[PDB]
Amino acid sequence: TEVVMENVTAFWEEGGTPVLKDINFKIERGQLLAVAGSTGAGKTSLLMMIMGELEPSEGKIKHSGRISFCSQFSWIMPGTIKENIIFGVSYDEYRYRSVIKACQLEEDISKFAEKDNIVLGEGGITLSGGQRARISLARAVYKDADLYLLDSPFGYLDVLTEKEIFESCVCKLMANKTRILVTSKMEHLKKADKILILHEGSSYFYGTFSELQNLQ
Ligand SMILES: O=c1ccn([C@H]2C[C@H](O)[C@@H](COP(=O)(O)OP(=O)(O)OP(=O)(O)O)O2)c(=O)[nH]1
Numbered sequence: 001t002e003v004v005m006e007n008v009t010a011f012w013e014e015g016g017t018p019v020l021k022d023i024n025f026k027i028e029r030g031q032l033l034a035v036a037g038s039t040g041a042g043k044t045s046l047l048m049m050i051m052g053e054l055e056p057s058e059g060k061i062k063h064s065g066r067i068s069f070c071s072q073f074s075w076i077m078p079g080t081i082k083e084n085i086i087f088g089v090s091y092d093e094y095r096y097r098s099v100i101k102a103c104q105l106e107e108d109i110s111k112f113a114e115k116d117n118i119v120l121g122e123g124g125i126t127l128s129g130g131q132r133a134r135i136s137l138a139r140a141v142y143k144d145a146d147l148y149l150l151d152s153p154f155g156y157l158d159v160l161t162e163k164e165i166f167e168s169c170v171c172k173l174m175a176n177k178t179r180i181l182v183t184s185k186m187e188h189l190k191k192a193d194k195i196l197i198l199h200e201g202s203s204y205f206y207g208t209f210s211e212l213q214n215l216q
């Protein structure tokens with residue numbers, strides 16, 4: 001097992017409403033967990049618990065290894081698009097090119113005369129929301145880690161682009177890696193090894209897409 005939550009309850013504020021209530025799941029090494037649910041349901045908070053920024057009041061948690069986290073709020077720091085993606089990690093041409101292809105960024109980059117040395121975050125180019133989201137995803141996927149926490153990374157993307165990048169990046173490029181993906185899209189739940197649907201902190205559903213279809 002790579003990540004376990006067992007009867008986890010947690011609070012951001014002592015004496016408040018629990019942000020997570022009796023949460024249970026298990027991910028084996030290399031599997032994909034999809035975490036779904038409405039705004040405020042506790043999805044980012046669950047990721048924060050895995051990253052150690054929120055401790056459980058009840059229950060047990062297991063996880064080891066390096067984490068790579070992709071925030072639901074895309075961000076850019078001053079520097080080239082290549083510097084933003086490798087972001088202090090050692091550079092390898094093949095690895096970098098595999099990530100930008102999987103994130104459909106080779107298309108965007110090929111159109112600039114400076115190519116991967118185009119400068120971001122310094123008042124020149126103003127990136128679209130979709131461009132910033134794919135750069136942020138690429139940054140998180142480039143990092144070598146044992147666990148990838150991808151919090152709603154497909155912001156500003158149309159449904160076909162989202163589908164293509166989910167398949168090329170999350171399913172193929174990252175096929176060997178333990179992944180938690182916060183997402184609500186049907187294909188992503190169908191392809192995940194397990195699904196956790198949160199509602200107001202509680203487990204609305206936990207199991208597989210097939211199990212949910214069998215309840216209809
Ligand atoms: O530092 C924090 C983060 C969250 N909350 C609260 C706000 C909210 O009532 C609850 C759930 O927030 P979360 O960000 O975990 O929800 P989400 O499922 O990620 O919502 P969204 O889909 O809008 O990202 O946790 C806090 O009090 N403090």
Ligand SMILES: [Mg+2]
Nearest residue numbers: 043044045072
């Ligand atoms: Mg969130």
